[PDB]
Design a binder for this molecule. Structure first.
Ligand SMILES: CCC(CC)CN(C[C@@H](O)[C@H](Cc1ccccc1)NC(=O)O[C@H]1CO[C@H]2OCC[C@H]21)S(=O)(=O)c1ccc([C@@H](O)CO)cc1
Lengths: 99, 99
């Protein structure tokens, strides 16, 4: 679809069989979701931005369906302020900015 | 223009005749610029990043030119590592997300 930006670009995602709401975030290199259980092994990672860094659990090659489009990639899980879909997955669903 | 997300969506902006590089960031409600000594009145503000909050100065009615489109609105100035153009200005230039 084409999504305008008068509202936060929040969309429903499906990950680990669970539905969640996440923000399409072109300013995020990476996808970061709030704490949750996901199957498979994870590695501890640090991710940083404004304010500094947080500790996250890195899950690789995770299926995630974003507004009906499938992606398989890295998902970071931790105490993020907001569920954000970053460019690592936005590229997979073919998302571009246009004006 | 169409901007893919293989790399950070950095564009040149003009603010006060000064040219800067900034992210087109659908994840930011408002525009956040690196420290710059703008004249005029401002009001204090706190914004929450992935690593916690920082203090910024809110300037209103600031003109920013983005790829031939002029936008005017709120700009937050503070110790951010990156210039980000937020939805408050992206909407004015007709920017959408598309997939
Ligand atoms: C996830 C944080 C989101 C939460 C919605 C909020 N931020 C936007 C987000 O795009 C941010 C931009 C960015 C900041 C620093 C360095 C590089 C990019 N990128 C980001 O942190 O990404 C993480 C994850 O991937 C990594 O790559 C880049 C860093 C890693 S913000 O800048 O802190 C912010 C907060 C409040 C407001 C107010 O206006 C109200 O919205 C406006 C803007």
């Amino acid at each position: 679809p084409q999504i305008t930006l008068w509202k936060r670009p929040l969309v429903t995602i499906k990950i680990g069989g669970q539905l969640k709401e996440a923000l399409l975030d072109t300013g995020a290199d990476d996808t970061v979701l709030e704490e949750m259980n996901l199957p498979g092994r994870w590695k501890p990672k640090m991710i940083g931005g404004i304010g500094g860094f947080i500790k996250v659990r890195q899950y690789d090659q995770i299926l995630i369906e974003i507004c009906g489009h499938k992606a398989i990639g890295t998902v970071l899980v931790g105490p993020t302020p907001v569920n954000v879909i970053g460019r690592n997955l936005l590229t997979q669903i073919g998302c571009t900015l246009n004006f």
